[PDB]
Amino acid sequence: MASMYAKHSAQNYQPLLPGIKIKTLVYGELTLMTEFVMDKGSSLPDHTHPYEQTGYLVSGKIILYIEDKKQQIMAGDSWCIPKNVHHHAEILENSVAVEVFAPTREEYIKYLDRTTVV
Amino acid sequence: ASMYAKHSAQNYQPLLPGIKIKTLVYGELTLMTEFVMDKGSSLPDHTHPYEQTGYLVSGKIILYIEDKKQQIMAGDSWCIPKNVHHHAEILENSVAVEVFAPTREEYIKYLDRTTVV
Ligand SMILES: [Cu+2]
Ligand SMILES: [Cu+2]
């Protein structure tokens, strides 16, 4: 089936934005999971995508903006951004986040680190 | 329909012996849950009509999907398609974040509303 495992790795993070590196961990028929490695002082500009985006902060500290809201996000915090909802972020510290997209975000399939897929 | 959620060390609700659960956030297509799992516990074999993609925040487990068996450490990830048999053995005090698609309605009742903004 669409079953897959993936092992953690410290390499193969593809650049996306200045200070923002991305890697697709796993994906299936309905979801796609990425891991965002973001550097202190960097920033995600405002963008909208036709994919629901639900996330979890593994480490670090960021400021997550959604619509009019502005919230400081630290390790263990989570968020769910519906499709086409404006969102951006300021990266205050070296942070890592796990973000799952739905439906399967076809564009990010190519970022999969196939060296770690079991 | 957007929402943030802050981390809180409580309101992790009973699910199974040694398995506590908390729904962090949920949307129109996804639902995120966090499983706190005690060393030596086990999830029994089950199937649900929801795709289950997960990330191991900490610990060490043994995840079974169909014939496959893999030892899962922190930073590892998996994806279990809908109605696929799966279970796990817990080797250490572990934490996993799991997202379900479509939004798993019967898990909305585990949402820790005290930390949702
Ligand atoms: Cu985005
Ligand atoms: Cu399950």
Side-chain angles (χ1 to χ4, degrees), chain A residues 3-8 25-26 28-31 33 35 52 54-56 64-67 69 71-72 74 76-80 83 98 102, chain B residues 2-7 24-25 27-30 32 34 51 53-55 63-65 68 70-71 74-79 81 84 97 99 101:
Chain A
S3 322
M4 69 166 76
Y5 309 92
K7 302 300 290 178
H8 179 249
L25 299 186
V26 290
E29 315 196 13
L30 293 171
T31 65
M33 172 183 291
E35 185 177 286
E52 182 160 288
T54 186
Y56 181 97
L64 188 48
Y65 300 76
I66 310 172
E67 305 141 311
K69 288 166 280 186
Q71 191 59 237
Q72 182 166 315
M74 265 159 295
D77 301 349
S78 66
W79 55 90
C80 185
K83 65 211 69 55
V98 169
Chain B
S2 172
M3 61 170 80
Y4 309 85
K6 277 288 201 169
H7 172 61
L24 304 187
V25 286
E28 290 163 337
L29 297 187
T30 56
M32 172 173 299
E34 196 175 21
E51 181 159 299
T53 175
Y55 180 92
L63 184 54
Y64 305 76
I65 309 170
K68 318 168 78 174
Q70 273 302 134
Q71 169 163 305
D76 301 357
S77 39
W78 56 91
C79 188
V84 164
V97 176
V99 179

Short mmCIF file of all heavy atoms in Angstrom, two decimals, chain A residues 3-8 25-26 28-31 33 35 52 54-56 64-67 69 71-72 74 76-80 83 98 102, chain B residues 2-7 24-25 27-30 32 34 51 53-55 63-65 68 70-71 74-79 81 84 97 99 101:
data_model
loop_
_atom_site.label_atom_id
_atom_site.label_comp_id
_atom_site.label_asym_id
_atom_site.label_seq_id
_atom_site.Cartn_x
_atom_site.Cartn_y
_atom_site.Cartn_z
N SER A 3 1.86 2.53 2.66
CA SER A 3 2.60 2.48 3.91
C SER A 3 4.06 2.83 3.66
O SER A 3 4.67 2.38 2.69
CB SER A 3 2.51 1.09 4.54
OG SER A 3 1.21 0.53 4.36
N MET A 4 4.63 3.66 4.54
CA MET A 4 6.06 3.92 4.48
C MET A 4 6.54 4.42 5.84
O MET A 4 5.83 5.14 6.54
CB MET A 4 6.41 4.93 3.38
CG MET A 4 5.95 6.35 3.62
SD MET A 4 6.73 7.52 2.49
CE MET A 4 5.81 7.20 0.98
N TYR A 5 7.74 3.98 6.21
CA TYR A 5 8.50 4.56 7.31
C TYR A 5 9.56 5.50 6.74
O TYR A 5 9.88 5.47 5.55
CB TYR A 5 9.17 3.47 8.15
CG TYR A 5 8.27 2.35 8.62
CD1 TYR A 5 8.13 1.19 7.88
CD2 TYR A 5 7.59 2.44 9.83
CE1 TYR A 5 7.32 0.15 8.31
CE2 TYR A 5 6.78 1.41 10.27
CZ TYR A 5 6.65 0.27 9.51
OH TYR A 5 5.84 -0.76 9.94
N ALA A 6 10.12 6.32 7.63
CA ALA A 6 11.25 7.16 7.27
C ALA A 6 12.10 7.37 8.51
O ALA A 6 11.57 7.63 9.60
CB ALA A 6 10.81 8.51 6.69
N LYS A 7 13.41 7.26 8.35
CA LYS A 7 14.34 7.48 9.44
C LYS A 7 14.79 8.93 9.47
O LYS A 7 14.84 9.62 8.44
CB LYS A 7 15.56 6.56 9.31
CG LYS A 7 15.21 5.08 9.28
CD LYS A 7 14.48 4.65 10.55
CE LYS A 7 15.40 4.67 11.76
NZ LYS A 7 14.67 4.30 13.01
N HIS A 8 15.11 9.41 10.67
CA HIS A 8 15.61 10.77 10.83
C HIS A 8 16.98 10.90 10.19
O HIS A 8 17.78 9.97 10.20
CB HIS A 8 15.67 11.14 12.31
CG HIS A 8 16.20 12.51 12.57
ND1 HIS A 8 17.43 12.74 13.16
CD2 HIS A 8 15.68 13.73 12.32
CE1 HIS A 8 17.63 14.04 13.26
NE2 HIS A 8 16.58 14.67 12.76
N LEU A 25 9.16 14.13 4.84
CA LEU A 25 9.47 12.91 5.58
C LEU A 25 8.77 11.70 4.98
O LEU A 25 9.42 10.76 4.51
CB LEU A 25 9.08 13.08 7.05
CG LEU A 25 9.79 14.21 7.82
CD1 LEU A 25 9.42 14.15 9.29
CD2 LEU A 25 11.30 14.14 7.63
N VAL A 26 7.44 11.72 4.99
CA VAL A 26 6.62 10.65 4.42
C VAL A 26 5.42 11.29 3.72
O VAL A 26 5.17 12.49 3.85
CB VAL A 26 6.13 9.65 5.49
CG1 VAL A 26 7.29 8.82 6.02
CG2 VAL A 26 5.45 10.39 6.63
N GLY A 28 1.26 9.97 1.90
CA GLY A 28 0.30 8.93 1.60
C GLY A 28 -0.76 9.39 0.63
O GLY A 28 -0.52 10.29 -0.19
N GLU A 29 -1.96 8.79 0.71
CA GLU A 29 -3.01 9.13 -0.24
C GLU A 29 -3.69 10.45 0.08
O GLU A 29 -4.23 11.11 -0.82
CB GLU A 29 -4.05 8.01 -0.28
CG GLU A 29 -3.44 6.62 -0.35
CD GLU A 29 -4.44 5.56 -0.76
OE1 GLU A 29 -5.53 5.92 -1.24
OE2 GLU A 29 -4.13 4.36 -0.62
N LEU A 30 -3.68 10.86 1.35
CA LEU A 30 -4.39 12.05 1.78
C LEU A 30 -3.51 13.11 2.43
O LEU A 30 -3.93 14.27 2.51
CB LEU A 30 -5.51 11.68 2.77
CG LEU A 30 -6.66 10.88 2.15
CD1 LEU A 30 -7.62 10.37 3.22
CD2 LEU A 30 -7.39 11.72 1.12
N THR A 31 -2.31 12.75 2.89
CA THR A 31 -1.47 13.68 3.64
C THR A 31 -0.05 13.66 3.10
O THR A 31 0.36 12.75 2.37
CB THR A 31 -1.44 13.35 5.14
OG1 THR A 31 -0.81 12.08 5.33
CG2 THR A 31 -2.84 13.30 5.70
N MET A 33 3.79 14.89 4.98
CA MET A 33 4.45 15.43 6.17
C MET A 33 5.82 15.98 5.80
O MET A 33 6.64 15.26 5.22
CB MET A 33 4.58 14.37 7.25
CG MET A 33 5.41 14.80 8.44
SD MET A 33 5.60 13.47 9.64
CE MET A 33 3.93 13.34 10.26
N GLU A 35 9.25 18.57 7.27
CA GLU A 35 9.98 19.02 8.45
C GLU A 35 10.73 20.29 8.07
O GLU A 35 11.59 20.26 7.19
CB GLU A 35 10.94 17.94 8.95
CG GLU A 35 11.66 18.27 10.24
CD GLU A 35 12.53 17.13 10.72
OE1 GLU A 35 11.99 16.12 11.22
OE2 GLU A 35 13.77 17.24 10.60
N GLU A 52 -4.69 22.48 3.38
CA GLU A 52 -4.72 22.66 4.82
C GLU A 52 -3.36 22.29 5.40
O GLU A 52 -2.73 21.32 4.98
CB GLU A 52 -5.82 21.81 5.45
CG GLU A 52 -5.94 21.98 6.96
CD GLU A 52 -7.29 21.54 7.49
OE1 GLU A 52 -8.29 22.25 7.24
OE2 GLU A 52 -7.35 20.48 8.14
N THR A 54 -1.39 21.77 9.00
CA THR A 54 -1.40 21.61 10.45
C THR A 54 0.01 21.24 10.91
O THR A 54 0.67 20.39 10.30
CB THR A 54 -2.44 20.56 10.90
OG1 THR A 54 -2.51 20.54 12.33
CG2 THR A 54 -2.11 19.17 10.38
N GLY A 55 0.48 21.90 11.97
CA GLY A 55 1.88 21.86 12.31
C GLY A 55 2.12 21.71 13.80
O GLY A 55 1.22 21.87 14.63
N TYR A 56 3.38 21.42 14.12
CA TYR A 56 3.83 21.14 15.48
C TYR A 56 5.27 21.61 15.60
O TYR A 56 6.11 21.24 14.77
CB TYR A 56 3.72 19.64 15.77
CG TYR A 56 4.14 19.21 17.16
CD1 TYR A 56 3.20 19.02 18.17
CD2 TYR A 56 5.47 18.95 17.45
CE1 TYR A 56 3.58 18.62 19.43
CE2 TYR A 56 5.86 18.55 18.71
CZ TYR A 56 4.91 18.38 19.70
OH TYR A 56 5.29 17.98 20.96
N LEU A 64 4.16 33.16 14.85
CA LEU A 64 3.29 32.69 13.78
C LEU A 64 2.13 33.66 13.62
O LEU A 64 1.36 33.88 14.56
CB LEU A 64 2.79 31.28 14.07
CG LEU A 64 2.02 30.56 12.96
CD1 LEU A 64 2.75 30.68 11.64
CD2 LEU A 64 1.80 29.10 13.33
N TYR A 65 2.01 34.24 12.42
CA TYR A 65 0.90 35.12 12.07
C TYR A 65 -0.10 34.34 11.23
O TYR A 65 0.28 33.65 10.28
CB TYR A 65 1.38 36.34 11.29
CG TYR A 65 2.37 37.23 12.01
CD1 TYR A 65 3.70 36.85 12.15
CD2 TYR A 65 1.99 38.46 12.52
CE1 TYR A 65 4.61 37.66 12.80
CE2 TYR A 65 2.89 39.28 13.17
CZ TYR A 65 4.20 38.88 13.31
OH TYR A 65 5.11 39.69 13.95
N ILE A 66 -1.38 34.46 11.58
CA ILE A 66 -2.47 33.87 10.79
C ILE A 66 -3.60 34.88 10.75
O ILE A 66 -4.14 35.26 11.79
CB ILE A 66 -2.97 32.54 11.38
CG1 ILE A 66 -1.81 31.59 11.68
CG2 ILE A 66 -3.94 31.88 10.42
CD1 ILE A 66 -2.22 30.35 12.43
N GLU A 67 -3.98 35.31 9.54
CA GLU A 67 -5.03 36.30 9.32
C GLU A 67 -4.65 37.55 10.10
O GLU A 67 -3.62 38.17 9.78
CB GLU A 67 -6.38 35.68 9.69
CG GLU A 67 -6.70 34.40 8.96
CD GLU A 67 -7.40 33.39 9.85
OE1 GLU A 67 -6.91 33.14 10.97
OE2 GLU A 67 -8.45 32.85 9.44
N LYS A 69 -4.32 37.36 13.54
CA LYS A 69 -3.77 36.88 14.80
C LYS A 69 -2.25 36.79 14.74
O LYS A 69 -1.65 36.60 13.67
CB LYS A 69 -4.37 35.52 15.14
CG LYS A 69 -5.83 35.60 15.57
CD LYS A 69 -6.50 34.23 15.60
CE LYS A 69 -6.91 33.79 14.20
NZ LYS A 69 -7.70 32.52 14.23
N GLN A 71 0.83 35.04 17.28
CA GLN A 71 1.05 34.20 18.45
C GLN A 71 2.50 33.74 18.50
O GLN A 71 3.05 33.33 17.48
CB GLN A 71 0.11 32.99 18.46
CG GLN A 71 0.11 32.22 19.76
CD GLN A 71 -0.30 33.09 20.93
OE1 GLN A 71 0.44 33.21 21.91
NE2 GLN A 71 -1.48 33.69 20.84
N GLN A 72 3.09 33.79 19.69
CA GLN A 72 4.45 33.29 19.89
C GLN A 72 4.40 31.77 20.08
O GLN A 72 3.69 31.28 20.97
CB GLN A 72 5.11 33.97 21.08
CG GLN A 72 6.54 33.53 21.33
CD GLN A 72 7.28 34.44 22.30
OE1 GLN A 72 7.20 35.67 22.20
NE2 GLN A 72 8.00 33.84 23.24
N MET A 74 6.35 28.12 20.68
CA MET A 74 7.52 27.44 21.22
C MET A 74 7.29 25.93 21.16
O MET A 74 6.27 25.46 20.67
CB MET A 74 7.83 27.91 22.65
CG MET A 74 8.87 29.01 22.71
SD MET A 74 8.81 29.97 24.23
CE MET A 74 7.20 30.74 24.06
N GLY A 76 6.33 22.27 21.40
CA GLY A 76 5.10 21.66 21.83
C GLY A 76 3.85 22.38 21.37
O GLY A 76 2.75 21.82 21.52
N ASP A 77 3.98 23.58 20.82
CA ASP A 77 2.83 24.30 20.32
C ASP A 77 2.43 23.76 18.95
O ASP A 77 3.23 23.17 18.23
CB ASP A 77 3.12 25.80 20.22
CG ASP A 77 3.50 26.41 21.55
OD1 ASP A 77 3.33 25.72 22.59
OD2 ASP A 77 3.96 27.56 21.57
N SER A 78 1.16 23.97 18.60
CA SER A 78 0.62 23.45 17.36
C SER A 78 -0.25 24.51 16.70
O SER A 78 -0.57 25.55 17.30
CB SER A 78 -0.18 22.17 17.59
OG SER A 78 -1.34 22.43 18.37
N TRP A 79 -0.64 24.24 15.46
CA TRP A 79 -1.45 25.15 14.68
C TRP A 79 -2.09 24.38 13.55
O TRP A 79 -1.55 23.37 13.08
CB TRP A 79 -0.62 26.31 14.12
CG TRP A 79 0.56 25.86 13.32
CD1 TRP A 79 0.60 25.62 11.98
CD2 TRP A 79 1.88 25.59 13.82
NE1 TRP A 79 1.86 25.22 11.61
CE2 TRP A 79 2.67 25.20 12.72
CE3 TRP A 79 2.47 25.65 15.08
CZ2 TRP A 79 4.01 24.86 12.85
CZ3 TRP A 79 3.80 25.32 15.21
CH2 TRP A 79 4.56 24.93 14.10
N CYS A 80 -3.26 24.85 13.11
CA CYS A 80 -3.92 24.32 11.93
C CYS A 80 -4.36 25.51 11.08
O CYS A 80 -5.19 26.31 11.51
CB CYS A 80 -5.13 23.45 12.28
SG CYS A 80 -5.90 22.66 10.84
N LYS A 83 -6.87 25.82 4.14
CA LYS A 83 -6.39 26.18 2.81
C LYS A 83 -6.70 27.64 2.51
O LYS A 83 -7.72 28.19 2.95
CB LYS A 83 -7.02 25.27 1.76
CG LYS A 83 -8.52 25.42 1.62
CD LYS A 83 -9.17 24.11 1.20
CE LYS A 83 -9.09 23.10 2.34
NZ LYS A 83 -9.70 23.64 3.59
N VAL A 98 7.34 20.35 12.38
CA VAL A 98 6.76 19.31 11.55
C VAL A 98 5.41 19.81 11.06
O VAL A 98 4.54 20.16 11.86
CB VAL A 98 6.61 17.99 12.32
CG1 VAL A 98 5.76 17.01 11.52
CG2 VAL A 98 7.97 17.39 12.62
N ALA A 102 -2.68 18.63 3.69
CA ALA A 102 -3.79 17.84 3.21
C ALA A 102 -4.56 18.71 2.22
O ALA A 102 -4.89 19.86 2.56
CB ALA A 102 -4.71 17.36 4.33
N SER B 2 -9.16 28.85 11.53
CA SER B 2 -7.80 28.61 11.99
C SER B 2 -7.75 28.58 13.52
O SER B 2 -8.62 29.11 14.21
CB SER B 2 -6.87 29.70 11.46
OG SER B 2 -5.58 29.60 12.04
N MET B 3 -6.70 27.94 14.04
CA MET B 3 -6.50 27.90 15.48
C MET B 3 -5.03 27.63 15.80
O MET B 3 -4.36 26.86 15.10
CB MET B 3 -7.39 26.83 16.15
CG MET B 3 -7.16 25.40 15.68
SD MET B 3 -8.04 24.20 16.71
CE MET B 3 -9.70 24.32 16.04
N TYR B 4 -4.54 28.29 16.85
CA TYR B 4 -3.30 27.92 17.51
C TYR B 4 -3.61 27.05 18.72
O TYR B 4 -4.75 26.98 19.20
CB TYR B 4 -2.51 29.15 17.98
CG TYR B 4 -2.24 30.27 17.00
CD1 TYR B 4 -3.18 31.27 16.79
CD2 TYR B 4 -1.03 30.36 16.33
CE1 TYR B 4 -2.93 32.31 15.91
CE2 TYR B 4 -0.77 31.40 15.46
CZ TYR B 4 -1.72 32.38 15.25
OH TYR B 4 -1.47 33.42 14.38
N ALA B 5 -2.57 26.42 19.25
CA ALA B 5 -2.67 25.70 20.51
C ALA B 5 -1.31 25.73 21.19
O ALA B 5 -0.28 25.51 20.54
CB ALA B 5 -3.14 24.25 20.31
N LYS B 6 -1.30 26.01 22.49
CA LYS B 6 -0.09 26.03 23.29
C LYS B 6 0.10 24.69 23.98
O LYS B 6 -0.85 23.94 24.23
CB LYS B 6 -0.15 27.16 24.33
CG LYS B 6 0.25 28.52 23.81
CD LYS B 6 1.75 28.58 23.56
CE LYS B 6 2.26 30.01 23.54
NZ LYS B 6 3.75 30.07 23.58
N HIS B 7 1.36 24.38 24.29
CA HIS B 7 1.65 23.14 25.00
C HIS B 7 1.29 23.27 26.47
O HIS B 7 1.55 24.30 27.10
CB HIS B 7 3.13 22.77 24.85
CG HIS B 7 3.55 21.62 25.71
ND1 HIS B 7 3.01 20.36 25.58
CD2 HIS B 7 4.45 21.54 26.71
CE1 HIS B 7 3.57 19.55 26.46
NE2 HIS B 7 4.44 20.24 27.16
N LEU B 24 -4.58 18.12 19.71
CA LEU B 24 -4.00 19.45 19.83
C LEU B 24 -4.81 20.48 19.06
O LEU B 24 -5.32 21.45 19.64
CB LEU B 24 -2.55 19.43 19.33
CG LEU B 24 -1.63 18.42 20.03
CD1 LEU B 24 -0.19 18.60 19.57
CD2 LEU B 24 -1.75 18.52 21.55
N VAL B 25 -4.92 20.30 17.74
CA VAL B 25 -5.74 21.14 16.88
C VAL B 25 -6.42 20.24 15.86
O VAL B 25 -6.07 19.07 15.71
CB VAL B 25 -4.91 22.23 16.16
CG1 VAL B 25 -4.52 23.33 17.13
CG2 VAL B 25 -3.66 21.62 15.54
N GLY B 27 -8.72 20.66 11.83
CA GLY B 27 -9.21 21.54 10.79
C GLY B 27 -10.32 20.94 9.95
O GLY B 27 -11.04 20.04 10.40
N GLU B 28 -10.48 21.44 8.73
CA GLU B 28 -11.47 20.90 7.82
C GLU B 28 -11.01 19.62 7.13
O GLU B 28 -11.84 18.88 6.61
CB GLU B 28 -11.84 21.95 6.77
CG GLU B 28 -12.65 23.11 7.32
CD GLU B 28 -12.64 24.31 6.39
OE1 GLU B 28 -11.70 24.42 5.57
OE2 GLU B 28 -13.57 25.15 6.48
N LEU B 29 -9.70 19.35 7.13
CA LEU B 29 -9.16 18.15 6.51
C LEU B 29 -8.27 17.32 7.41
O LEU B 29 -8.03 16.15 7.09
CB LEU B 29 -8.36 18.50 5.24
CG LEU B 29 -9.10 19.15 4.07
CD1 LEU B 29 -8.17 19.25 2.87
CD2 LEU B 29 -10.36 18.37 3.72
N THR B 30 -7.76 17.87 8.51
CA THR B 30 -6.81 17.16 9.36
C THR B 30 -7.24 17.24 10.82
O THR B 30 -8.12 18.01 11.21
CB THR B 30 -5.39 17.72 9.22
OG1 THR B 30 -5.40 19.13 9.50
CG2 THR B 30 -4.84 17.49 7.83
N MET B 32 -4.84 16.70 14.56
CA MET B 32 -3.55 16.39 15.15
C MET B 32 -3.73 15.92 16.58
O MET B 32 -4.38 16.60 17.39
CB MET B 32 -2.62 17.61 15.11
CG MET B 32 -1.32 17.41 15.87
SD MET B 32 -0.17 18.77 15.64
CE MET B 32 0.08 18.70 13.86
N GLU B 34 -1.58 13.93 20.03
CA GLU B 34 -0.31 13.62 20.67
C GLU B 34 -0.52 12.46 21.63
O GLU B 34 -1.41 12.52 22.49
CB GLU B 34 0.25 14.84 21.40
CG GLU B 34 1.72 14.75 21.76
CD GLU B 34 2.24 16.04 22.37
OE1 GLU B 34 1.42 16.83 22.88
OE2 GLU B 34 3.47 16.26 22.35
N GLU B 51 -6.38 7.92 7.29
CA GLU B 51 -4.95 7.85 7.10
C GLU B 51 -4.24 8.42 8.32
O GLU B 51 -4.62 9.46 8.85
CB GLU B 51 -4.55 8.62 5.84
CG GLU B 51 -3.06 8.59 5.53
CD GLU B 51 -2.78 8.89 4.07
OE1 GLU B 51 -3.25 8.12 3.21
OE2 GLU B 51 -2.10 9.90 3.79
N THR B 53 -0.61 9.52 9.60
CA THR B 53 0.79 9.88 9.41
C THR B 53 1.30 10.47 10.72
O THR B 53 0.64 11.32 11.32
CB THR B 53 0.98 10.86 8.25
OG1 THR B 53 2.34 11.28 8.19
CG2 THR B 53 0.08 12.08 8.40
N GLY B 54 2.47 10.00 11.17
CA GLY B 54 2.94 10.32 12.50
C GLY B 54 4.41 10.69 12.52
O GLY B 54 5.16 10.43 11.57
N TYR B 55 4.80 11.29 13.63
CA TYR B 55 6.17 11.73 13.88
C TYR B 55 6.49 11.44 15.33
O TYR B 55 5.71 11.80 16.22
CB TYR B 55 6.32 13.23 13.58
CG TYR B 55 7.70 13.80 13.81
CD1 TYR B 55 8.63 13.84 12.78
CD2 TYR B 55 8.07 14.31 15.04
CE1 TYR B 55 9.90 14.37 12.97
CE2 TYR B 55 9.34 14.84 15.25
CZ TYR B 55 10.24 14.86 14.21
OH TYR B 55 11.50 15.39 14.41
N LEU B 63 7.02 -0.20 15.49
CA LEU B 63 5.78 0.02 14.77
C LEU B 63 5.57 -1.07 13.73
O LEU B 63 6.49 -1.37 12.95
CB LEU B 63 5.78 1.40 14.10
CG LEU B 63 4.50 1.83 13.38
CD1 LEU B 63 3.30 1.72 14.30
CD2 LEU B 63 4.66 3.24 12.87
N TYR B 64 4.38 -1.66 13.72
CA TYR B 64 4.02 -2.73 12.80
C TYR B 64 2.94 -2.21 11.85
O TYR B 64 1.88 -1.77 12.30
CB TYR B 64 3.50 -3.96 13.54
CG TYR B 64 4.43 -4.53 14.60
CD1 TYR B 64 4.56 -3.91 15.84
CD2 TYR B 64 5.15 -5.70 14.37
CE1 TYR B 64 5.40 -4.43 16.81
CE2 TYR B 64 5.98 -6.22 15.34
CZ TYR B 64 6.11 -5.59 16.55
OH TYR B 64 6.94 -6.11 17.52
N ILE B 65 3.22 -2.25 10.55
CA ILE B 65 2.24 -1.93 9.52
C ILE B 65 2.21 -3.10 8.55
O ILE B 65 3.19 -3.34 7.83
CB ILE B 65 2.57 -0.63 8.78
CG1 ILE B 65 2.83 0.51 9.76
CG2 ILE B 65 1.43 -0.25 7.84
CD1 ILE B 65 3.41 1.75 9.11
N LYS B 68 5.27 -5.30 7.81
CA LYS B 68 6.50 -4.57 8.09
C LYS B 68 6.65 -4.28 9.58
O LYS B 68 5.68 -4.02 10.29
CB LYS B 68 6.51 -3.26 7.29
CG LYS B 68 6.02 -3.44 5.86
CD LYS B 68 5.77 -2.10 5.18
CE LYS B 68 7.07 -1.45 4.72
NZ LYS B 68 6.80 -0.22 3.93
N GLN B 70 9.44 -1.97 12.11
CA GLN B 70 10.55 -1.03 12.15
C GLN B 70 10.67 -0.42 13.54
O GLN B 70 9.67 0.00 14.13
CB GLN B 70 10.37 0.09 11.12
CG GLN B 70 10.91 -0.26 9.74
CD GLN B 70 12.39 -0.60 9.77
OE1 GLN B 70 12.82 -1.60 9.19
NE2 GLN B 70 13.17 0.22 10.47
N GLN B 71 11.89 -0.39 14.07
CA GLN B 71 12.16 0.33 15.30
C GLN B 71 12.21 1.82 15.00
O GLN B 71 12.97 2.26 14.13
CB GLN B 71 13.48 -0.13 15.93
CG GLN B 71 13.94 0.76 17.07
CD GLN B 71 14.98 0.10 17.95
OE1 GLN B 71 14.76 -0.99 18.48
NE2 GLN B 71 16.12 0.76 18.11
N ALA B 74 13.36 8.95 17.79
CA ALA B 74 12.93 10.33 17.65
C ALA B 74 13.37 10.90 16.30
O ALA B 74 14.47 10.63 15.82
CB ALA B 74 13.49 11.18 18.79
N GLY B 75 12.49 11.70 15.70
CA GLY B 75 12.73 12.23 14.37
C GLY B 75 12.28 11.33 13.24
O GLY B 75 12.31 11.76 12.08
N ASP B 76 11.87 10.10 13.54
CA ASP B 76 11.36 9.21 12.51
C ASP B 76 9.89 9.50 12.24
O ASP B 76 9.19 10.13 13.04
CB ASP B 76 11.53 7.75 12.92
CG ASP B 76 12.98 7.38 13.18
OD1 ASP B 76 13.86 8.24 12.99
OD2 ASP B 76 13.24 6.22 13.58
N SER B 77 9.42 9.03 11.08
CA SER B 77 8.06 9.30 10.64
C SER B 77 7.50 8.08 9.93
O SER B 77 8.24 7.19 9.50
CB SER B 77 8.01 10.53 9.72
OG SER B 77 9.13 10.54 8.84
N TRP B 78 6.17 8.05 9.81
CA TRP B 78 5.48 6.94 9.18
C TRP B 78 4.18 7.44 8.56
O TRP B 78 3.73 8.55 8.83
CB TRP B 78 5.21 5.81 10.17
CG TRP B 78 4.43 6.26 11.38
CD1 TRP B 78 3.07 6.26 11.52
CD2 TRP B 78 4.96 6.76 12.60
NE1 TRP B 78 2.73 6.74 12.76
CE2 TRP B 78 3.87 7.06 13.45
CE3 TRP B 78 6.26 7.00 13.07
CZ2 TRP B 78 4.04 7.57 14.73
CZ3 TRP B 78 6.42 7.51 14.35
CH2 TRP B 78 5.31 7.79 15.16
N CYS B 79 3.58 6.59 7.73
CA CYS B 79 2.27 6.87 7.15
C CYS B 79 1.52 5.56 7.00
O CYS B 79 2.01 4.64 6.35
CB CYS B 79 2.40 7.59 5.81
SG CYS B 79 0.81 8.15 5.16
N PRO B 81 -1.96 4.10 5.62
CA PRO B 81 -3.18 4.40 4.87
C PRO B 81 -4.42 3.87 5.57
O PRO B 81 -4.36 3.13 6.55
CB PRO B 81 -2.96 3.72 3.51
CG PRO B 81 -1.86 2.73 3.74
CD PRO B 81 -1.01 3.29 4.83
N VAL B 84 -5.77 0.13 7.37
CA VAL B 84 -4.60 -0.73 7.34
C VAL B 84 -4.27 -1.16 8.76
O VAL B 84 -4.18 -0.32 9.67
CB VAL B 84 -3.41 -0.02 6.68
CG1 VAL B 84 -2.11 -0.75 7.00
CG2 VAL B 84 -3.61 0.05 5.19
N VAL B 97 3.39 12.47 17.65
CA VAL B 97 2.34 13.31 17.08
C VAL B 97 1.80 12.60 15.84
O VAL B 97 2.57 12.19 14.97
CB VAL B 97 2.88 14.70 16.71
CG1 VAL B 97 1.80 15.52 16.02
CG2 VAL B 97 3.38 15.42 17.96
N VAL B 99 -1.28 12.76 12.77
CA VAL B 99 -2.32 13.50 12.06
C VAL B 99 -3.21 12.50 11.35
O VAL B 99 -2.73 11.50 10.81
CB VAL B 99 -1.73 14.52 11.07
CG1 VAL B 99 -2.83 15.25 10.33
CG2 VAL B 99 -0.83 15.50 11.80
N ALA B 101 -6.38 11.99 8.47
CA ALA B 101 -7.16 12.54 7.37
C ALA B 101 -8.14 11.48 6.87
O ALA B 101 -7.76 10.31 6.72
CB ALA B 101 -6.27 13.00 6.21
#
